[PDB]
Amino acid sequence: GMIISLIAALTENRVIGKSNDLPWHLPDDMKYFMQTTLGHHVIMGRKNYESIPAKFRPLANRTNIVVTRQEEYDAAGCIVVNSIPAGIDIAIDNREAEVFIIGGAEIYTQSLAFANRLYLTEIQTSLEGDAFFPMFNKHEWNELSRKHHPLDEKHRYSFDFVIYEKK
C-alpha cells in the first residue's frame, strides 16, 4: 500500500504557520524534512512553493507537486494539480512507495482523511496561534518513533521528531 504522510512542525498547543517564515526557525527541522522526503513525492501548497528561493526551487531529487485553485498557475519543473486527491492520483501512477504532504491548516484538514502516517515535529513550546494542526484521535494512531532534539545556539526551542501511524 501507498503510505500517505503529512509532515509538519507544531507547538504543544498545535500551532502551525501560514506561509514562509514560521513562528519558529529550526535549521535541523528543515534538514530533517530534506532527509525524510528525499526521493519521494511531495505535495505542497501554493504558499509553500512560492516561499522557496528560486535558487533551490524546485526541490532537488524530488517530484514537486503543487496544489492550487489558480487556473493555469505556472510552475516549471513541477506538476500542478487543482486538488490534493489529484496529486495523490499521480503518485500512485508512478508507483511511489510513500507520498508526503505539506501546507497550512486547510491542507492538513483536507488530507487528514487519507493520512496513514504522521511525521510531527513537536516543538516543546506554546505560542499564540490562529491556524492549527487538525485534531486526530490519539487512540487511532500509534507512535512509531520519537527523537528529542535538544535546544542549542542554533535552536531557540527544543523539539522532537515523532512518527505516528494509523492502526
PDB file of N, CA, C and O in Angstrom, residues 72-142:
ATOM      1  N   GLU A  72      -4.413  27.611 -14.539  1.00  0.00           N
ATOM      2  CA  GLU A  72      -3.213  27.852 -15.343  1.00  0.00           C
ATOM      3  C   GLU A  72      -2.141  28.578 -14.538  1.00  0.00           C
ATOM      4  O   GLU A  72      -1.449  29.465 -15.043  1.00  0.00           O
ATOM      5  N   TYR A  73      -2.004  28.202 -13.269  1.00  0.00           N
ATOM      6  CA  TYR A  73      -0.896  28.689 -12.461  1.00  0.00           C
ATOM      7  C   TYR A  73       0.393  28.019 -12.923  1.00  0.00           C
ATOM      8  O   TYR A  73       0.482  26.788 -12.966  1.00  0.00           O
ATOM      9  N   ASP A  74       1.387  28.828 -13.274  1.00  0.00           N
ATOM     10  CA  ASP A  74       2.587  28.333 -13.938  1.00  0.00           C
ATOM     11  C   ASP A  74       3.642  27.946 -12.910  1.00  0.00           C
ATOM     12  O   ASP A  74       4.030  28.762 -12.066  1.00  0.00           O
ATOM     13  N   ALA A  75       4.109  26.701 -12.992  1.00  0.00           N
ATOM     14  CA  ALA A  75       5.206  26.207 -12.164  1.00  0.00           C
ATOM     15  C   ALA A  75       6.017  25.240 -13.013  1.00  0.00           C
ATOM     16  O   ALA A  75       5.548  24.140 -13.323  1.00  0.00           O
ATOM     17  N   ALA A  76       7.222  25.650 -13.398  1.00  0.00           N
ATOM     18  CA  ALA A  76       8.074  24.842 -14.257  1.00  0.00           C
ATOM     19  C   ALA A  76       8.932  23.904 -13.419  1.00  0.00           C
ATOM     20  O   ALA A  76       9.377  24.259 -12.324  1.00  0.00           O
ATOM     21  N   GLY A  77       9.162  22.702 -13.944  1.00  0.00           N
ATOM     22  CA  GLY A  77       9.854  21.669 -13.205  1.00  0.00           C
ATOM     23  C   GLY A  77       9.002  20.941 -12.190  1.00  0.00           C
ATOM     24  O   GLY A  77       9.485  19.981 -11.577  1.00  0.00           O
ATOM     25  N   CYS A  78       7.758  21.366 -11.991  1.00  0.00           N
ATOM     26  CA  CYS A  78       6.840  20.740 -11.056  1.00  0.00           C
ATOM     27  C   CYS A  78       5.567  20.339 -11.786  1.00  0.00           C
ATOM     28  O   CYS A  78       5.273  20.826 -12.882  1.00  0.00           O
ATOM     29  N   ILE A  79       4.811  19.441 -11.166  1.00  0.00           N
ATOM     30  CA  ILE A  79       3.478  19.089 -11.636  1.00  0.00           C
ATOM     31  C   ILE A  79       2.473  19.930 -10.865  1.00  0.00           C
ATOM     32  O   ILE A  79       2.675  20.256  -9.686  1.00  0.00           O
ATOM     33  N   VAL A  80       1.393  20.315 -11.540  1.00  0.00           N
ATOM     34  CA  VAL A  80       0.398  21.223 -10.984  1.00  0.00           C
ATOM     35  C   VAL A  80      -0.959  20.536 -11.017  1.00  0.00           C
ATOM     36  O   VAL A  80      -1.404  20.080 -12.077  1.00  0.00           O
ATOM     37  N   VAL A  81      -1.612  20.465  -9.857  1.00  0.00           N
ATOM     38  CA  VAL A  81      -2.944  19.893  -9.734  1.00  0.00           C
ATOM     39  C   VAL A  81      -3.842  20.901  -9.031  1.00  0.00           C
ATOM     40  O   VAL A  81      -3.375  21.833  -8.372  1.00  0.00           O
ATOM     41  N   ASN A  82      -5.150  20.703  -9.183  1.00  0.00           N
ATOM     42  CA  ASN A  82      -6.139  21.594  -8.590  1.00  0.00           C
ATOM     43  C   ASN A  82      -6.695  21.081  -7.270  1.00  0.00           C
ATOM     44  O   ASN A  82      -7.382  21.835  -6.573  1.00  0.00           O
ATOM     45  N   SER A  83      -6.420  19.829  -6.911  1.00  0.00           N
ATOM     46  CA  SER A  83      -6.891  19.273  -5.651  1.00  0.00           C
ATOM     47  C   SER A  83      -5.858  18.287  -5.130  1.00  0.00           C
ATOM     48  O   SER A  83      -5.041  17.755  -5.885  1.00  0.00           O
ATOM     49  N   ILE A  84      -5.903  18.054  -3.815  1.00  0.00           N
ATOM     50  CA  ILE A  84      -4.968  17.108  -3.198  1.00  0.00           C
ATOM     51  C   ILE A  84      -5.168  15.688  -3.706  1.00  0.00           C
ATOM     52  O   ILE A  84      -4.166  14.997  -3.947  1.00  0.00           O
ATOM     53  N   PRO A  85      -6.393  15.171  -3.877  1.00  0.00           N
ATOM     54  CA  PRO A  85      -6.529  13.831  -4.473  1.00  0.00           C
ATOM     55  C   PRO A  85      -5.903  13.713  -5.852  1.00  0.00           C
ATOM     56  O   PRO A  85      -5.379  12.644  -6.192  1.00  0.00           O
ATOM     57  N   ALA A  86      -5.940  14.778  -6.657  1.00  0.00           N
ATOM     58  CA  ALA A  86      -5.317  14.727  -7.977  1.00  0.00           C
ATOM     59  C   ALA A  86      -3.815  14.496  -7.867  1.00  0.00           C
ATOM     60  O   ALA A  86      -3.233  13.758  -8.669  1.00  0.00           O
ATOM     61  N   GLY A  87      -3.171  15.120  -6.879  1.00  0.00           N
ATOM     62  CA  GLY A  87      -1.767  14.844  -6.634  1.00  0.00           C
ATOM     63  C   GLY A  87      -1.533  13.461  -6.063  1.00  0.00           C
ATOM     64  O   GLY A  87      -0.470  12.870  -6.278  1.00  0.00           O
ATOM     65  N   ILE A  88      -2.511  12.929  -5.329  1.00  0.00           N
ATOM     66  CA  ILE A  88      -2.415  11.555  -4.845  1.00  0.00           C
ATOM     67  C   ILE A  88      -2.569  10.576  -6.002  1.00  0.00           C
ATOM     68  O   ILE A  88      -1.872   9.555  -6.068  1.00  0.00           O
ATOM     69  N   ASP A  89      -3.471  10.877  -6.940  1.00  0.00           N
ATOM     70  CA  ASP A  89      -3.678  10.008  -8.092  1.00  0.00           C
ATOM     71  C   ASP A  89      -2.466   9.966  -9.015  1.00  0.00           C
ATOM     72  O   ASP A  89      -2.308   8.998  -9.765  1.00  0.00           O
ATOM     73  N   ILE A  90      -1.617  10.993  -8.984  1.00  0.00           N
ATOM     74  CA  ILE A  90      -0.394  10.965  -9.778  1.00  0.00           C
ATOM     75  C   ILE A  90       0.673  10.124  -9.086  1.00  0.00           C
ATOM     76  O   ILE A  90       1.413   9.380  -9.739  1.00  0.00           O
ATOM     77  N   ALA A  91       0.750  10.210  -7.755  1.00  0.00           N
ATOM     78  CA  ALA A  91       1.771   9.471  -7.020  1.00  0.00           C
ATOM     79  C   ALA A  91       1.544   7.967  -7.102  1.00  0.00           C
ATOM     80  O   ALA A  91       2.507   7.193  -7.161  1.00  0.00           O
ATOM     81  N   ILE A  92       0.282   7.529  -7.104  1.00  0.00           N
ATOM     82  CA  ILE A  92       0.010   6.100  -7.231  1.00  0.00           C
ATOM     83  C   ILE A  92       0.319   5.618  -8.641  1.00  0.00           C
ATOM     84  O   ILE A  92       0.654   4.445  -8.844  1.00  0.00           O
ATOM     85  N   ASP A  93       0.214   6.503  -9.634  1.00  0.00           N
ATOM     86  CA  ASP A  93       0.520   6.114 -11.006  1.00  0.00           C
ATOM     87  C   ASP A  93       2.009   5.852 -11.185  1.00  0.00           C
ATOM     88  O   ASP A  93       2.402   4.951 -11.935  1.00  0.00           O
ATOM     89  N   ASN A  94       2.852   6.623 -10.503  1.00  0.00           N
ATOM     90  CA  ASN A  94       4.297   6.476 -10.594  1.00  0.00           C
ATOM     91  C   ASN A  94       4.847   5.436  -9.623  1.00  0.00           C
ATOM     92  O   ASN A  94       6.062   5.397  -9.404  1.00  0.00           O
ATOM     93  N   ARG A  95       3.979   4.606  -9.040  1.00  0.00           N
ATOM     94  CA  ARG A  95       4.388   3.504  -8.165  1.00  0.00           C
ATOM     95  C   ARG A  95       5.212   4.001  -6.978  1.00  0.00           C
ATOM     96  O   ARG A  95       6.148   3.338  -6.528  1.00  0.00           O
ATOM     97  N   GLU A  96       4.859   5.177  -6.465  1.00  0.00           N
ATOM     98  CA  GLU A  96       5.541   5.718  -5.299  1.00  0.00           C
ATOM     99  C   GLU A  96       5.236   4.872  -4.069  1.00  0.00           C
ATOM    100  O   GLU A  96       4.118   4.380  -3.896  1.00  0.00           O
ATOM    101  N   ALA A  97       6.244   4.693  -3.217  1.00  0.00           N
ATOM    102  CA  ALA A  97       6.077   3.911  -2.000  1.00  0.00           C
ATOM    103  C   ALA A  97       5.561   4.733  -0.828  1.00  0.00           C
ATOM    104  O   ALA A  97       4.968   4.164   0.095  1.00  0.00           O
ATOM    105  N   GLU A  98       5.767   6.049  -0.843  1.00  0.00           N
ATOM    106  CA  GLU A  98       5.334   6.903   0.259  1.00  0.00           C
ATOM    107  C   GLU A  98       5.286   8.339  -0.234  1.00  0.00           C
ATOM    108  O   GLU A  98       6.296   8.860  -0.719  1.00  0.00           O
ATOM    109  N   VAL A  99       4.124   8.976  -0.112  1.00  0.00           N
ATOM    110  CA  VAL A  99       3.933  10.353  -0.550  1.00  0.00           C
ATOM    111  C   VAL A  99       3.890  11.254   0.677  1.00  0.00           C
ATOM    112  O   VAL A  99       3.451  10.849   1.760  1.00  0.00           O
ATOM    113  N   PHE A 100       4.366  12.485   0.505  1.00  0.00           N
ATOM    114  CA  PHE A 100       4.418  13.465   1.579  1.00  0.00           C
ATOM    115  C   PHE A 100       3.580  14.682   1.215  1.00  0.00           C
ATOM    116  O   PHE A 100       3.442  15.034   0.040  1.00  0.00           O
ATOM    117  N   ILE A 101       3.020  15.321   2.240  1.00  0.00           N
ATOM    118  CA  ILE A 101       2.109  16.447   2.068  1.00  0.00           C
ATOM    119  C   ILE A 101       2.466  17.520   3.088  1.00  0.00           C
ATOM    120  O   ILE A 101       2.589  17.232   4.282  1.00  0.00           O
ATOM    121  N   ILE A 102       2.634  18.757   2.617  1.00  0.00           N
ATOM    122  CA  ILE A 102       2.911  19.897   3.482  1.00  0.00           C
ATOM    123  C   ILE A 102       1.980  21.042   3.107  1.00  0.00           C
ATOM    124  O   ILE A 102       1.411  21.082   2.014  1.00  0.00           O
ATOM    125  N   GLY A 103       1.832  21.977   4.036  1.00  0.00           N
ATOM    126  CA  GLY A 103       0.971  23.126   3.825  1.00  0.00           C
ATOM    127  C   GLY A 103       0.554  23.724   5.158  1.00  0.00           C
ATOM    128  O   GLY A 103       1.238  23.563   6.167  1.00  0.00           O
ATOM    129  N   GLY A 104      -0.579  24.411   5.132  1.00  0.00           N
ATOM    130  CA  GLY A 104      -1.155  25.035   6.305  1.00  0.00           C
ATOM    131  C   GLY A 104      -2.228  24.181   6.948  1.00  0.00           C
ATOM    132  O   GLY A 104      -2.183  22.946   6.905  1.00  0.00           O
ATOM    133  N   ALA A 105      -3.211  24.848   7.557  1.00  0.00           N
ATOM    134  CA  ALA A 105      -4.292  24.137   8.231  1.00  0.00           C
ATOM    135  C   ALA A 105      -5.342  23.644   7.249  1.00  0.00           C
ATOM    136  O   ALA A 105      -5.987  22.620   7.495  1.00  0.00           O
ATOM    137  N   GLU A 106      -5.521  24.351   6.135  1.00  0.00           N
ATOM    138  CA  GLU A 106      -6.503  23.926   5.145  1.00  0.00           C
ATOM    139  C   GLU A 106      -6.078  22.642   4.445  1.00  0.00           C
ATOM    140  O   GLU A 106      -6.934  21.842   4.050  1.00  0.00           O
ATOM    141  N   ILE A 107      -4.774  22.439   4.268  1.00  0.00           N
ATOM    142  CA  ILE A 107      -4.287  21.266   3.553  1.00  0.00           C
ATOM    143  C   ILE A 107      -4.283  20.048   4.465  1.00  0.00           C
ATOM    144  O   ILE A 107      -4.706  18.956   4.065  1.00  0.00           O
ATOM    145  N   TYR A 108      -3.817  20.215   5.704  1.00  0.00           N
ATOM    146  CA  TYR A 108      -3.794  19.097   6.639  1.00  0.00           C
ATOM    147  C   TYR A 108      -5.201  18.654   7.016  1.00  0.00           C
ATOM    148  O   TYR A 108      -5.419  17.472   7.303  1.00  0.00           O
ATOM    149  N   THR A 109      -6.165  19.578   7.016  1.00  0.00           N
ATOM    150  CA  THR A 109      -7.547  19.201   7.299  1.00  0.00           C
ATOM    151  C   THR A 109      -8.155  18.433   6.133  1.00  0.00           C
ATOM    152  O   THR A 109      -8.945  17.503   6.339  1.00  0.00           O
ATOM    153  N   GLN A 110      -7.794  18.801   4.903  1.00  0.00           N
ATOM    154  CA  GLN A 110      -8.322  18.101   3.738  1.00  0.00           C
ATOM    155  C   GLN A 110      -7.667  16.739   3.552  1.00  0.00           C
ATOM    156  O   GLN A 110      -8.323  15.795   3.098  1.00  0.00           O
ATOM    157  N   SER A 111      -6.387  16.614   3.898  1.00  0.00           N
ATOM    158  CA  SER A 111      -5.632  15.389   3.678  1.00  0.00           C
ATOM    159  C   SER A 111      -5.591  14.478   4.898  1.00  0.00           C
ATOM    160  O   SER A 111      -5.012  13.390   4.820  1.00  0.00           O
ATOM    161  N   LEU A 112      -6.184  14.890   6.021  1.00  0.00           N
ATOM    162  CA  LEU A 112      -6.225  14.027   7.194  1.00  0.00           C
ATOM    163  C   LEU A 112      -7.119  12.812   6.979  1.00  0.00           C
ATOM    164  O   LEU A 112      -6.927  11.789   7.645  1.00  0.00           O
ATOM    165  N   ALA A 113      -8.080  12.897   6.056  1.00  0.00           N
ATOM    166  CA  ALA A 113      -8.990  11.783   5.816  1.00  0.00           C
ATOM    167  C   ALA A 113      -8.320  10.627   5.086  1.00  0.00           C
ATOM    168  O   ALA A 113      -8.860   9.515   5.091  1.00  0.00           O
ATOM    169  N   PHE A 114      -7.164  10.855   4.460  1.00  0.00           N
ATOM    170  CA  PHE A 114      -6.438   9.797   3.771  1.00  0.00           C
ATOM    171  C   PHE A 114      -5.066   9.521   4.369  1.00  0.00           C
ATOM    172  O   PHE A 114      -4.326   8.697   3.820  1.00  0.00           O
ATOM    173  N   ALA A 115      -4.706  10.172   5.471  1.00  0.00           N
ATOM    174  CA  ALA A 115      -3.375  10.017   6.042  1.00  0.00           C
ATOM    175  C   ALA A 115      -3.257   8.692   6.785  1.00  0.00           C
ATOM    176  O   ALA A 115      -4.111   8.354   7.611  1.00  0.00           O
ATOM    177  N   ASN A 116      -2.197   7.943   6.482  1.00  0.00           N
ATOM    178  CA  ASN A 116      -1.861   6.730   7.213  1.00  0.00           C
ATOM    179  C   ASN A 116      -0.611   6.879   8.067  1.00  0.00           C
ATOM    180  O   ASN A 116      -0.364   6.027   8.927  1.00  0.00           O
ATOM    181  N   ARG A 117       0.179   7.929   7.851  1.00  0.00           N
ATOM    182  CA  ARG A 117       1.363   8.204   8.648  1.00  0.00           C
ATOM    183  C   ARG A 117       1.401   9.690   8.971  1.00  0.00           C
ATOM    184  O   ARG A 117       0.828  10.511   8.250  1.00  0.00           O
ATOM    185  N   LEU A 118       2.082  10.028  10.063  1.00  0.00           N
ATOM    186  CA  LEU A 118       2.145  11.406  10.540  1.00  0.00           C
ATOM    187  C   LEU A 118       3.538  11.683  11.083  1.00  0.00           C
ATOM    188  O   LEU A 118       3.951  11.076  12.074  1.00  0.00           O
ATOM    189  N   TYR A 119       4.251  12.605  10.440  1.00  0.00           N
ATOM    190  CA  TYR A 119       5.615  12.973  10.811  1.00  0.00           C
ATOM    191  C   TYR A 119       5.565  14.343  11.484  1.00  0.00           C
ATOM    192  O   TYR A 119       5.804  15.374  10.856  1.00  0.00           O
ATOM    193  N   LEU A 120       5.259  14.352  12.780  1.00  0.00           N
ATOM    194  CA  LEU A 120       5.146  15.598  13.528  1.00  0.00           C
ATOM    195  C   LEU A 120       6.478  15.966  14.169  1.00  0.00           C
ATOM    196  O   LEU A 120       7.141  15.119  14.778  1.00  0.00           O
ATOM    197  N   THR A 121       6.856  17.235  14.036  1.00  0.00           N
ATOM    198  CA  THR A 121       7.995  17.804  14.754  1.00  0.00           C
ATOM    199  C   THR A 121       7.419  18.623  15.904  1.00  0.00           C
ATOM    200  O   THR A 121       7.165  19.822  15.776  1.00  0.00           O
ATOM    201  N   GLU A 122       7.203  17.961  17.038  1.00  0.00           N
ATOM    202  CA  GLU A 122       6.523  18.569  18.180  1.00  0.00           C
ATOM    203  C   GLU A 122       7.489  19.502  18.897  1.00  0.00           C
ATOM    204  O   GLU A 122       8.384  19.059  19.623  1.00  0.00           O
ATOM    205  N   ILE A 123       7.305  20.803  18.696  1.00  0.00           N
ATOM    206  CA  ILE A 123       8.123  21.812  19.359  1.00  0.00           C
ATOM    207  C   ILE A 123       7.602  22.005  20.778  1.00  0.00           C
ATOM    208  O   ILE A 123       6.439  22.374  20.977  1.00  0.00           O
ATOM    209  N   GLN A 124       8.462  21.758  21.766  1.00  0.00           N
ATOM    210  CA  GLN A 124       8.080  21.845  23.177  1.00  0.00           C
ATOM    211  C   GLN A 124       7.988  23.316  23.572  1.00  0.00           C
ATOM    212  O   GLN A 124       8.862  23.878  24.238  1.00  0.00           O
ATOM    213  N   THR A 125       6.895  23.943  23.148  1.00  0.00           N
ATOM    214  CA  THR A 125       6.618  25.339  23.456  1.00  0.00           C
ATOM    215  C   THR A 125       5.145  25.601  23.184  1.00  0.00           C
ATOM    216  O   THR A 125       4.448  24.779  22.583  1.00  0.00           O
ATOM    217  N   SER A 126       4.675  26.758  23.642  1.00  0.00           N
ATOM    218  CA  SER A 126       3.298  27.182  23.441  1.00  0.00           C
ATOM    219  C   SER A 126       3.303  28.600  22.895  1.00  0.00           C
ATOM    220  O   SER A 126       3.911  29.492  23.492  1.00  0.00           O
ATOM    221  N   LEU A 127       2.645  28.800  21.752  1.00  0.00           N
ATOM    222  CA  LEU A 127       2.571  30.096  21.091  1.00  0.00           C
ATOM    223  C   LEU A 127       1.118  30.463  20.829  1.00  0.00           C
ATOM    224  O   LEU A 127       0.255  29.591  20.690  1.00  0.00           O
ATOM    225  N   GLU A 128       0.855  31.766  20.755  1.00  0.00           N
ATOM    226  CA  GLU A 128      -0.460  32.243  20.348  1.00  0.00           C
ATOM    227  C   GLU A 128      -0.615  32.048  18.844  1.00  0.00           C
ATOM    228  O   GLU A 128       0.149  32.617  18.056  1.00  0.00           O
ATOM    229  N   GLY A 129      -1.591  31.242  18.446  1.00  0.00           N
ATOM    230  CA  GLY A 129      -1.762  30.898  17.049  1.00  0.00           C
ATOM    231  C   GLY A 129      -3.186  31.106  16.578  1.00  0.00           C
ATOM    232  O   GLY A 129      -4.141  31.027  17.349  1.00  0.00           O
ATOM    233  N   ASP A 130      -3.310  31.379  15.278  1.00  0.00           N
ATOM    234  CA  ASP A 130      -4.601  31.491  14.617  1.00  0.00           C
ATOM    235  C   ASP A 130      -4.871  30.354  13.642  1.00  0.00           C
ATOM    236  O   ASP A 130      -6.007  30.219  13.174  1.00  0.00           O
ATOM    237  N   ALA A 131      -3.863  29.545  13.323  1.00  0.00           N
ATOM    238  CA  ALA A 131      -4.018  28.362  12.491  1.00  0.00           C
ATOM    239  C   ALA A 131      -3.467  27.165  13.248  1.00  0.00           C
ATOM    240  O   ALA A 131      -2.428  27.265  13.907  1.00  0.00           O
ATOM    241  N   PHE A 132      -4.162  26.033  13.154  1.00  0.00           N
ATOM    242  CA  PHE A 132      -3.850  24.878  13.981  1.00  0.00           C
ATOM    243  C   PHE A 132      -3.830  23.597  13.160  1.00  0.00           C
ATOM    244  O   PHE A 132      -4.557  23.454  12.173  1.00  0.00           O
ATOM    245  N   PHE A 133      -2.978  22.667  13.586  1.00  0.00           N
ATOM    246  CA  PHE A 133      -2.985  21.328  13.024  1.00  0.00           C
ATOM    247  C   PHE A 133      -4.291  20.629  13.399  1.00  0.00           C
ATOM    248  O   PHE A 133      -4.758  20.754  14.535  1.00  0.00           O
ATOM    249  N   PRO A 134      -4.907  19.904  12.467  1.00  0.00           N
ATOM    250  CA  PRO A 134      -6.198  19.271  12.760  1.00  0.00           C
ATOM    251  C   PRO A 134      -6.093  18.267  13.897  1.00  0.00           C
ATOM    252  O   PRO A 134      -5.073  17.598  14.079  1.00  0.00           O
ATOM    253  N   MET A 135      -7.172  18.169  14.668  1.00  0.00           N
ATOM    254  CA  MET A 135      -7.232  17.202  15.753  1.00  0.00           C
ATOM    255  C   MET A 135      -7.315  15.787  15.195  1.00  0.00           C
ATOM    256  O   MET A 135      -8.037  15.522  14.231  1.00  0.00           O
ATOM    257  N   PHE A 136      -6.563  14.874  15.805  1.00  0.00           N
ATOM    258  CA  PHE A 136      -6.624  13.461  15.466  1.00  0.00           C
ATOM    259  C   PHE A 136      -6.680  12.643  16.746  1.00  0.00           C
ATOM    260  O   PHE A 136      -5.992  12.955  17.724  1.00  0.00           O
ATOM    261  N   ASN A 137      -7.512  11.605  16.736  1.00  0.00           N
ATOM    262  CA  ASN A 137      -7.676  10.751  17.904  1.00  0.00           C
ATOM    263  C   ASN A 137      -6.381   9.997  18.185  1.00  0.00           C
ATOM    264  O   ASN A 137      -5.909   9.226  17.343  1.00  0.00           O
ATOM    265  N   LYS A 138      -5.807  10.218  19.370  1.00  0.00           N
ATOM    266  CA  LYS A 138      -4.592   9.506  19.746  1.00  0.00           C
ATOM    267  C   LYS A 138      -4.835   8.015  19.942  1.00  0.00           C
ATOM    268  O   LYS A 138      -3.872   7.241  19.973  1.00  0.00           O
ATOM    269  N   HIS A 139      -6.096   7.597  20.074  1.00  0.00           N
ATOM    270  CA  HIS A 139      -6.408   6.175  20.149  1.00  0.00           C
ATOM    271  C   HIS A 139      -6.318   5.502  18.786  1.00  0.00           C
ATOM    272  O   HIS A 139      -6.069   4.293  18.713  1.00  0.00           O
ATOM    273  N   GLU A 140      -6.516   6.257  17.707  1.00  0.00           N
ATOM    274  CA  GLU A 140      -6.480   5.712  16.357  1.00  0.00           C
ATOM    275  C   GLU A 140      -5.077   5.658  15.768  1.00  0.00           C
ATOM    276  O   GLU A 140      -4.903   5.109  14.675  1.00  0.00           O
ATOM    277  N   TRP A 141      -4.080   6.210  16.453  1.00  0.00           N
ATOM    278  CA  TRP A 141      -2.717   6.247  15.948  1.00  0.00           C
ATOM    279  C   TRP A 141      -1.763   5.670  16.984  1.00  0.00           C
ATOM    280  O   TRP A 141      -2.074   5.590  18.175  1.00  0.00           O
ATOM    281  N   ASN A 142      -0.586   5.266  16.509  1.00  0.00           N
ATOM    282  CA  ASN A 142       0.460   4.710  17.353  1.00  0.00           C
ATOM    283  C   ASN A 142       1.781   5.395  17.037  1.00  0.00           C
ATOM    284  O   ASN A 142       2.102   5.636  15.869  1.00  0.00           O
TER     285      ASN A 142
END
